[PDB]
Amino acid sequence: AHRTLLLRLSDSGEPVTSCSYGQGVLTLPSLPLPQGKKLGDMPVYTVKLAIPAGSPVTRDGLIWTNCPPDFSTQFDREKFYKKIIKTSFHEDDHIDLDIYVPGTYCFYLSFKNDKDELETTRKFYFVVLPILSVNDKFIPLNSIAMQSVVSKWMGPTIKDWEKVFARVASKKYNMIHFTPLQHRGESNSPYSIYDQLEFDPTVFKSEKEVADMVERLRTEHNILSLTDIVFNHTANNSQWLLDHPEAGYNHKTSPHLISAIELDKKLLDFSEQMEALGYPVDLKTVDDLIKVMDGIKEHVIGELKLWEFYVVDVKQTVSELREKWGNSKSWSDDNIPSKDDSTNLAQFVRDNATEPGFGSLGERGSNKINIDKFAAILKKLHSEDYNNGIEELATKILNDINLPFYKEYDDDINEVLEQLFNRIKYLRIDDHGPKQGPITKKLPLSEPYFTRFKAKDGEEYALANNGAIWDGNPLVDFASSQSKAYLRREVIVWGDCVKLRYGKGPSDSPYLWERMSKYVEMNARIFNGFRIDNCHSTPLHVGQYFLDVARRVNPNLYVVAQLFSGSEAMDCLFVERLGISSLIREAMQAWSEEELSRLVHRHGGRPIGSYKFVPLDDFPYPADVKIDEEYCAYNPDDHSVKCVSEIMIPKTLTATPPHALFMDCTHDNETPNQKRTVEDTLPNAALVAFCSSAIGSVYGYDEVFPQLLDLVQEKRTYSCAENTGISKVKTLLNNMREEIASEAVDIEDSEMHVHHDGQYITFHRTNAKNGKGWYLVARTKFHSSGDQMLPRIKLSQTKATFKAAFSLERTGDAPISDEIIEGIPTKLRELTGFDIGFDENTKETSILLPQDFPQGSIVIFETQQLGIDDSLDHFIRSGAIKATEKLSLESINYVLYRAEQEEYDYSEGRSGAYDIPDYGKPVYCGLQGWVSILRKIIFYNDLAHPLSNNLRNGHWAVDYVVNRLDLYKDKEGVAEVQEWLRSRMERIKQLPSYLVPSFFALVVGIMYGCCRLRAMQLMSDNVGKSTVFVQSLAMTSIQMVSAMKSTSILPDQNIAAMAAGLPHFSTNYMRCWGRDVFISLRGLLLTTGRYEEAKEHILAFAKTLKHGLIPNLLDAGRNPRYNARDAAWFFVQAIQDYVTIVPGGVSLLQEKVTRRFPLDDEYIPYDDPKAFSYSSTIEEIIYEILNRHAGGIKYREANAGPNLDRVMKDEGFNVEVNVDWETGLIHGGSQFNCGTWMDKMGESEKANSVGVPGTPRDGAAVEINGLLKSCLRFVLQLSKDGKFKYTEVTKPDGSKISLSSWNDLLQENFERCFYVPKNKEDDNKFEIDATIINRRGIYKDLYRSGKPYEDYQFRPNFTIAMVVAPELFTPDYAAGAIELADQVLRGPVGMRTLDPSDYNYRPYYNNGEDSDDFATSKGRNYHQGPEWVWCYGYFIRAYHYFNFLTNPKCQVEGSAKKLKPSSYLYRKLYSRLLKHREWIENSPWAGLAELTNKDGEVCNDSSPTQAWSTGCLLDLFYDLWISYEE
């Protein structure tokens, strides 16, 4: 049905970790195939990759993967396959990788670099676990019970083995591991295989004989089987080692070990004649070792020629020097240092006059000097005559060359004999282990480092045996040339083995690779899996090829590994590439009771009440996504992986720790009897079995065998004593786990708590889905440490039930049968007396232990949490979509956002945000305020966060989420959204307190995703199908557009109104500024589809026209303020943006709007009937601006005084505007009025800045006239199409200028008046005074302003005209100027409001500073350095247009040669929005800020989410979509 996992990829192609589960491996869940389906009838899993839109890997991007395309295709490690990434700047691309058979699969990416070269990412691996079933029942990988048995101790007949089989079948083990059943070598140890392709002839003969026995175990006792596979060595007496002696490391294949061979045979030649002339054979004296090492420091070390293996033969170089005296003379260079610098001189001869392999160990005299090149230097340095002190000089050089070799020799020798007298002690003289057997044909003084034989080729060989080191890195092959192990004698050799030499591939050892393959695929035909001993010592490429060969034979191969790498990462990397399915963990390794508790905690599961993952605000919500209406698209028999909620966002694939196979005792560690006692066998195996993983045990652990059986020597047979030891308990433990394996699935479905009080260890196991669980109390018997009483066990909101209890007791010692390995007699005594109290008020359960609970005892309780039933996951993950059905884009504002001051408007000052103790308040009262805090908590599973603490300390926040919506209950769909929350929050409170936090975030997160999806559904298609970064900016519309009670856009009705920004510009009069509204009107409402809401805003300000202007501070129409020379032209520009985008937008012009003002600019006749008298259509309103602007406007700030502005003096009150018709631009403003977007009013009394405007923009602002040209260009085409009835503007005096002529006057004079030429030659045409100038290639900021140097200032204001009126700009002048702004005025997220070179560059805004610095005090520096995000929008808007026309690399066109940009241009756009993507991504407030200090430093005062800061970035995405994505 639906077995699809989502694997999100980063901008660099790396997988995204959805949760922090630690250093892990991308593993896919072990689930059975669907009902009646075999391998091949359908895909096992579908990995859906997600590549971001516009990422650097989209540029000519491909997806490589070794996943075979279909089931008919086999697997090859290097046979990758191409997949095309569908590039887009809006829509992310999904690519499926259907998997048909388990194994190891990797993927990498190829893309086009910024250097236009090819580049590749890492190989990223993911593993699909095999499907284990015995008769037909699926065996979950974490319900496996493995019983390891040694072959040579089970009787010499097949039926003798089937007696041992029936014994472990009663103990209810489901899997058996075998030591390899092959013909064993000389030592008969099970790991020195005589012939890998021949099974042990004592028992079986044919291959069907062993295959029929393993299938018998499957059909008789329901037991799967697996075997050890030996890669690293073979027996030291194989009849094929004589034919192919090159399969191992010999003097030919690895010549560096020759120095170690002549030393090993210097001891087999010494340990048989040592005492003959020496003295001590086997004495237990310190002096005996000294004289033995004195016999060593005189007959082996000193008898090997001072080791010429390092030192250059001094006198044999001078002899070979003079022998020719360099007939080939060839040095005239001066690269030789002076003879004084004897250090570099020695290195110089070493770097030039040496045969290849200098320093590299090989033959006896393999480090020699190139004579013809050495005598050439000697003739150059000293003399061309030999008798001129060459014998002294040449020897002086070589002696200094061998000084680092003489000291490398002393460091080697000191380690050879120090390792010797340290092991021969432990080998013989009982330090802690004795057996002092003297000289022998099997036990000399030194163990055999090399196996000697005479091969069939005739020559003699000396293959080495493998072993181990101490703390040495196991990845380093000690048998390779990189290690000096066999020489320095640091090898714990295993004589029965012979280190097998694999190369870089089958090319280095052909017969070894061919024989091991046929040996691996022979066992793969029979068994269900393998066990790899010392896998960390097997090289990766060796195991990768052989495990793939096995999986091609057995597709469901189950691999267990003994993996000990230095880091968890290397262990993960080994599991990633090799395809390992289980990592062995040993319980006997814990030295104390505390270490076993920590080992148990590691593989036990996740904490109780652990957080669950939910797609929050970090996911794209496509409006065209499938859904399960009531979590009903999951039939059980389909075995489909479930999505998180009703929204079918598939289950994310994240790196999880590799699965573990916990062994209470392996076949190599000592017996509980040896390390601890025989009593601890019961609690140890009880804590092991309770873990959430696979378990295993060696045979003899349950039967309480005496001591660890030596796998080399012993020949005794297992005893047939049935039901001994723990056999009765393991039958209860394994059968219990069989019931749990039915419903325990994912990592979030198995929770656990462990406690350690002395010799007791507590294990609480819990299934998070149903509430079921077990409680285990195990008293550990490491040492008999006296009577200890455990306190009262108190369970919260739970009920307990006694299951069983036991105690293992020793009834003396074990028999000493020399024919059968019998165990220790043990009594299994069932216990009682466990008092289970249950308070029926607090629902608390108390458990008390009886005084008779000795060490080596356990007791098991079956628990069940109250409140949690099986139908709880279904109730919470359903109904949220239907609840959000009636939501509107306005109503979703109250569900998710609402700042605290906005909430106070509806609650009259009684509610606000739920103050989380020891933290603060969420940013929004809605769900978003929780989600921003909850996401990083769920990611880190932080149950210690103050939010998690408060959630389990009470139910205050649980009811606060539901009780807020009483303020907004009457709005569209909120009542049904609140009702869903109320019913789910009610069900949550009936749960244990520690489980409220995990379920609280889940209920909030699911209702959040269905609300955010409801937003993409109501909005348009360009938004709903885009990337998270686009949808994140789109939600700002819902944020800003909110109905209030203290304000609105209409004076008669409190309807929806757009805020300038949260939280400061959201309440009362300071909410909707006309300038801020209409700059954002195209980005927040038009780009998203809020046409009706955008029309209401246009009609609302149309009633407030006065002085031929649109008011800045809109007082909902109830007496506003008209200090806005900028508002009217951003307002009329939004009219053009409305008609251009909205289908049928021309209807706006003929929309009557009740003119609440006498057109003759009067005072404030508010309720006077003249307000409700006449109206003016938008058409009239538009022309009213133009005609009155240049024609007739003359006003002082109406109804002024401190009531209006307190600081702005009377000089700023009387302000005006006039168009110089000899240029056509809109001049106006005073040096006392800040009627532009840079509206700053001084207020520092301590600097005499009171009333002084911070940035007065009198004259012709680039933005004002730029929007005027766009207005004129629009109104012309309006009449050409047949609407706008006006064509001539009335001149002030009484004349009549034409509109197209006014449109032409700007076109003929605008760029002439503003542009500053880069060349001083053309300063005579563009009206420039070169004395007051800053940078050339600059478009002006103001024309004939008050202070003429504010004219020639680099500011981001010109780019508004570059976007609304591109016809005023010649391409090369505009592109050359916008590149300067990108190099100077562009911050990371905000646009610098002033050139950093200009003296007035104060880029640190501080409105609390009340000092004497004119700018910094009281925030006068507002627009003199600080970086604003909205100007960045218009900047990159024109950066797209002009760099498209100008530079040709940004062009490639395509279909119908429609001009479409290139990947290089999209790469220049994407790279300038990632600092913006970061901001909203990692900001609590979901949005971009109003301000930003120098280089993105968070301005403390800046409103964190601003309207026109985000709408200006949404404007860019509409251009790239409406002009190319067709």
Ligand SMILES: OC[C@H]1O[C@H](O[C@H]2[C@H](O)[C@@H](O)[C@@H](O[C@H]3[C@H](O)[C@@H](O)[C@@H](O[C@H]4[C@H](O)[C@@H](O)[C@@H](O[C@H]5[C@H](O)[C@@H](O)[C@@H](O)O[C@@H]5CO)O[C@@H]4CO)O[C@@H]3CO)O[C@@H]2CO)[C@H](O)[C@@H](O)[C@@H]1O
């Ligand atoms: O509602 C009726 C109202 O009547 C009178 O109103 C006028 C004010 O007295 C008058 O000063 C002016 O308001 C000015 C404002 O004083 C001025 O400083 C400037 O606005 C700037 C700030 O200068 C600037 O520091 C910054 O302030 C933000 C801050 O950055 C932000 O982090 C957060 O702290 O919020 C602060 C604002 O609260 O930005 C603002 C952006 O405007 O210009 C304003 C005019 O545009 O005009 C008022 C006109 O009614 C009474 O005086 C007033 O008390 C009554 O409330």
Ligand SMILES: OC[C@H]1O[C@H](O[C@H]2[C@H](O)[C@@H](O)[C@@H](O[C@H]3[C@H](O)[C@@H](O)[C@@H](O)O[C@@H]3CO)O[C@@H]2CO)[C@H](O)[C@@H](O)[C@@H]1O
């Ligand atoms: O109650 C309103 C207002 O009354 C007072 O303000 C007035 C001044 O007292 C009065 O002198 C005058 O001040 C202005 C000058 O007439 C004008 O020529 C120019 O110099 O600007 C002066 C300041 O505006 O008129 C104002 C009108 O408000 C009183 O001081 C205020 O506190 C009080 O709010």
Ligand SMILES: OC[C@H]1O[C@H](O[C@H]2[C@H](O)[C@@H](O)[C@@H](O)O[C@@H]2CO)[C@H](O)[C@@H](O)[C@@H]1O
């Ligand atoms: O102060 C001179 C210094 O700053 C300049 O910028 C302004 C200056 O701040 C004004 O006082 C006046 O001199 O006009 C200058 C140009 O607009 C320049 O940025 C700088 O090169 C100059 O040395």
